[PDB]
Design a binder for these strands. Structure first.
Lengths: 185, 159, 222, 51, 58, 171
RNA sequence: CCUGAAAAUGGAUGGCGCUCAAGCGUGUUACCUAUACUCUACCGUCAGGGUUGAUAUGAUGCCCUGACGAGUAGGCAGGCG
RNA sequence: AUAUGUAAGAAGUCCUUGUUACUUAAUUGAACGUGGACAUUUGAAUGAAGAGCUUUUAGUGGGCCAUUUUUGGUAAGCAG
RNA sequence: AUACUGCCAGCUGGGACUGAGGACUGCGACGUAAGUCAAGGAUGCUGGCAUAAUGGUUAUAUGCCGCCCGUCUUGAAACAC
């Protein structure tokens, strides 16, 4: 009937209505759909999309990453926003007085922020304080640093971490991996 | 059995030319190539070092590397359902500059000149190219050009 | 806060002013069409009087209707039909004639009937089967408001403005034609007039360039 | 909800085109033309009838 | 029991399903395969120009 | 269909080397204007070095019979392709217009030689008005002086299937 | 058109039958009808949107809009036992 | 002829060259740069029904037919 | 003059299918104007029945159509299993 130029009845390709059955996450999603619909600020659309995300797409964000973000010139007094878990970091010895709004705080991260003097805030309190996302800075954790992702795209001459259980000599260090034994990859 | 060697079925492709055999004139060696130049590839049958494969005969690529007597050419080769990057190390005998871009640089220079004249005066430059338009109305006269009536001819053997 | 009648009256006044602009614009468009037609006739008569021949300007606009179905179409003609937006049988589209356009039409000649449409058939097509593309959605024109809202950046503020831009191929023909959704035509009401369609119009068939007979065909199909 | 087609439904016609009213009033569909009889050359008809 | 030996039938259609999209071009293509003498000088010259730019705007 | 005769004048596309080419003309019997132009370019391609791309058409004008209600003799010189070769032939028709003479010639060639439209070239149609120039017997038969004949065995087509008297073929 | 023109159960322009055809060649119209095309309703799918009233309604609710729908092997989804 | 590579810009065009262990007889070039002149027409057409990018896994890995090109064969509802 | 063609936001009739939506909002027309309208989807008048009359189910008859499923297979109703 019609020469279709595209696939028919194709879904969005993106998430909506997060897969979680968390009632409180659903409440946050409901609040931020209201905001993203009736406020025309890009921040709330971004935060709604990020609330839809899965666990591996919401990597933890360390307080060290928070501090490195606040070190940006003019960003010292912005509200740090992490849609995910803010984790502690013992590789830093000072932390500023920032306000961080996050989904979850570890005990260490919350204690570190509070002792530094700033405040740990939930996304609903962040929405109350900054309905349009004014003076905020969104931080995202490192996504392509997982162990699963280092086996992605494995092949000859790719350098991408074979899928292996035991490591050491005589575990795939031989013919096909050195010129002494046949060839190299 | 079947034979697929490096120069398989290149009998006429690498044939030199009619009355153009022998040594290579020196302009091909006096020509210089810089990284980013667009070059057509046409192998010289007389020179057998740095010869392109028969796939790259008639392909146009971009220089990425210049060496003592050679250039490195980037080409997009169609492999399967995608394009792959290929890097050829060819000699200037088989390499030659491309005029496809040079026409475009001439046009961009002309466009800049017209832009400057527009910034001067504002006379509707119309920089953009256009396809051939349908022919406009014209008036053809018959003064000294009265129409000549033609008719189909009868069939005759001619043999 | 009451907003009972003041804003409504202001909106009515603004709408009346817009209707006035549309009225004068349409009167000017009619004058322009009439003047062009009479000048073509007068130029032909003057050349005939002076002993010359007046050559018609080659037609700048064609209407193309897909005549063949969506089965057993080679890849190049199929892609060209997709690019001309004739993705189904009896689907029609206006096409500004250039060299590139002419080669496109030559490629898909066995699968289309096209020709040089007249003001009457363009106006009838846009009035009856005029649907616009708004947010990738096919909504009927049925109002000057939607055409103004989607093409007022180019000065096209009414359906007759859009019709004028289509017929007298304007600087914004591409945008007006793209805004016009592909015309979904029926089969010709009196039939195709030929026992078999898929021969050229010259050979007693249907496909190819029926230059001015596309008007009769499309008016039957519309 | 329902598409009312112009070329009928004179209401929708006038809604879309304020000029339809005066086109109908002045009968511009059937409009006469001025007569000026420019005479064609004899060579034109000679070529036309050339057997 | 002889069988079919080879055909390219259906291969182009299979390729064009999700196929011959052009290669993804990048600003700053990889310097791999370039003359290493040039590469050495490029390392040194880039170090120098970074130092000069820092001195200009520290 | 109903053939019309067209004068089609076309020329080569004027060039700056020499503008205003020689402006050739043809008489073409065709169903309509598009076919008239197509046949003009067909015969011009056969005659001169030109094609639709390389040339243009400056005039198309359908020609009427001078007196379409008077009976004349028409000598038609044609050439046509058979299943074996190409042959020139000469026929003639009694008719009132050249268009109807050509249409009946097309029917005649189809019926008597299975020659389709594509394989027929009307070389010439000449309106001959005097006798002793009519060469065919099947025309000189009807140029007989004071000709009168009957129409024996009149068959009357009836509308109703059943008839209640036996028919008569009297006239 | 005819001769050339011979294969085995009885026998197939599909059959009856047809001869200024209901045959052959070619023109002109009228007419018939596909799950195709146009318009409408309804179902589902997809998409884009709207919607924070203290109220009696659980915001994967209530709505507006458009486009789509063949299917083995196979994949996934929503459901019934 | 048909098919086929490339280009039709902002990652673009032009300028005293800042760096270098490369290169040059040589602040000659080469490459990479700072800075400087350039949009509402950012440089043909048509379309774009979103573009790009991953991960993972099913079935399949006997094919066959038609037009056109074509090989073996007298040919085949043959083989390629 | 007529023919042929093109146009009319020309006029006047005969038929058929559909009536989705459900306070208003919009765009327009009408002597511009209080108001009316054919203008974001059928109303008005009337009649008979109110019951197996319509309809559902079922059996038959009639018109047209309909090969035996599962399987392997390029191909199955197969004189393949």
């Amino acid at each position: 009937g019609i020469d279709h130029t595209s696939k028919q009845h194709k879904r969005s390709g993106h998430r909506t209505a997060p897969k979680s059955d968390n009632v409180y996450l659903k409440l946050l999603v409901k609040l931020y759909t209201f905001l993203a619909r009736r406020t025309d600020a890009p921040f709330n659309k971004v935060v709604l999309k990020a609330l839809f995300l899965s666990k591996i797409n919401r990597p933890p964000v360390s307080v060290s990453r928070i501090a490195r973000a606040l070190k940006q010139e003019g960003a010292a007094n912005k509200t740090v926003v992490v849609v995910g878990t803010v984790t502690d970091d013992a590789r830093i010895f000072e932390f500023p007085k920032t306000t961080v709004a996050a989904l979850r705080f570890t005990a260490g991260a919350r204690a570190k922020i509070v002792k530094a003097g700033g405040e740990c805030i939930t996304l609903d309190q962040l929405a109350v304080r900054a309905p349009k996302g004014q003076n905020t800075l969104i931080l995202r954790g490192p996504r392509n640093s997982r162990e699963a992702v280092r086996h992605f795209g494995m092949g000859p001459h790719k350098g991408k971490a074979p899928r292996i259980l035991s490591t050491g000599r005589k575990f795939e260090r031989a013919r096909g991996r050195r010129r002494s034994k046949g060839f190299k990859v | 059995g079947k034979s697929h060697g490096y120069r398989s079925r290149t009998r006429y492709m690498f044939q030199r030319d009619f009355r153009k055999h022998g040594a290579v004139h020196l302009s091909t060696y006096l020509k210089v190539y810089k990284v980013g130049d667009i070059v057509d590839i046409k192998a010289n049958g007389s020179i057998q070092k740095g010869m392109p494969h028969k796939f790259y005969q008639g392909k146009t690529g971009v220089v990425y590397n210049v060496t003592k007597s050679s250039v490195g050419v980037i080409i997009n080769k169609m492999v399967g359902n995608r394009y792959l990057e290929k890097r050829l190390n060819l000699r200037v005998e088989h390499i030659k500059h491309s005029k496809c871009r040079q026409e475009f640089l001439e046009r961009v220079k002309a466009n800049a000149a017209k832009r400057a004249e527009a910034k001067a005066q504002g006379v509707a430059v119309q920089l953009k190219r256009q396809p051939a338009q349908p022919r406009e109305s014209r008036i053809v006269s018959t003064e000294g050009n009265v129409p000549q009536t033609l008719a189909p001819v009868p069939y005759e053997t001619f043999i | 806060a009451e907003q009972v009648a003041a804003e409504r009256a202001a909106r009515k006044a603004a709408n009346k002013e817009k209707r006035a602009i549309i009225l004068e614009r349409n009167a000017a468009y009619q004058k322009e069409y009439e003047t062009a037609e009479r000048n073509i006739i007068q130029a032909k008569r003057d050349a005939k009087a002076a002993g010359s021949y007046y050559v018609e300007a080659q037609h700048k606009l064609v209407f193309v209707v897909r005549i063949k179905g969506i089965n057993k179409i080679p890849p190049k003609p199929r892609k060209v039909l997709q690019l001309l937006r004739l993705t189904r049988i009896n689907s029609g589209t206006f096409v500004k004639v250039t060299k590139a356009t002419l080669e496109l039409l030559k490629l898909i000649e066995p699968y289309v009937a096209y020709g040089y449409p007249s003001y009457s058939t363009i106006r009838q097509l846009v009035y009856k089967r005029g649907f616009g593309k708004i947010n990738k959605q096919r909504v009927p024109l049925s109002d000057n408001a939607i055409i103004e809202a989607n093409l007022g950046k180019y000065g096209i503020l009414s359906i007759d403005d859009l019709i004028h831009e289509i017929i007298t191929v304007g600087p914004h023909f591409k945008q007006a034609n793209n805004f016009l959704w592909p015309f979904k035509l029926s089969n010709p009401s009196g039939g195709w007039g030929v026992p078999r369609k898929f021969k050229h119009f010259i050979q007693g068939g249907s496909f190819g360039n029926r230059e001015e007979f596309i008007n009769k065909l499309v008016k039957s199909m519309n | 909800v329902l598409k009312k087609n112009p070329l009928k439904n004179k209401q929708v016609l006038l809604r879309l085109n304020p000029y339809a009213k005066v086109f109908a009033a002045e009968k511009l569909g059937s409009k006469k033309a001025e007569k000026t009889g420019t005479k064609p050359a004899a060579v034109f008809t000679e070529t036309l009838k050339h057997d | 029991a002889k069988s079919k030996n080879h055909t390219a039938h259906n291969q182009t259609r299979k390729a064009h399903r999700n196929g011959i999209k052009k290669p993804k071009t990048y600003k700053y293509p990889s310097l791999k395969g370039v003359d290493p003498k040039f590469r050495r000088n490029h390392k040194h010259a880039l170090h120098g120009t970074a130092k000069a730019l820092a001195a200009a705007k520290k | 269909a109903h053939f019309k005769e067209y004068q089609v004048i076309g020329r080569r596309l004027p060039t700056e080397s020499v503008p205003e080419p020689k402006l050739f003309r043809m008489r073409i019997f065709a169903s309509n204007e598009v076919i008239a132009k197509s046949r003009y370019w067909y015969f011009l391609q056969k005659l001169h070095k030109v094609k639709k791309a390389s040339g243009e058409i400056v005039s198309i004008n359908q020609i009427n019979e001078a007196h379409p209600t008077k009976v004349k003799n028409f000598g038609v010189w044609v050439r046509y392709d058979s299943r074996s070769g190409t042959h020139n032939m000469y026929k003639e028709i009694r008719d009132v217009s050249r268009v109807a003479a050509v249409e009946t010639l097309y029917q005649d060639m189809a019926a008597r030689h299975r020659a389709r439209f594509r394989s027929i070239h009307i070389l010439k149609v000449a309106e001959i008005e005097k006798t002793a120039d009519v060469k065919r017997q099947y025309v000189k038969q009807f140029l007989t002086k004071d000709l009168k004949f009957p129409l024996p065995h009149r068959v009357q087509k009836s509308t109703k299937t059943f008839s209640y008297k036996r028919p008569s073929t009297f006239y």
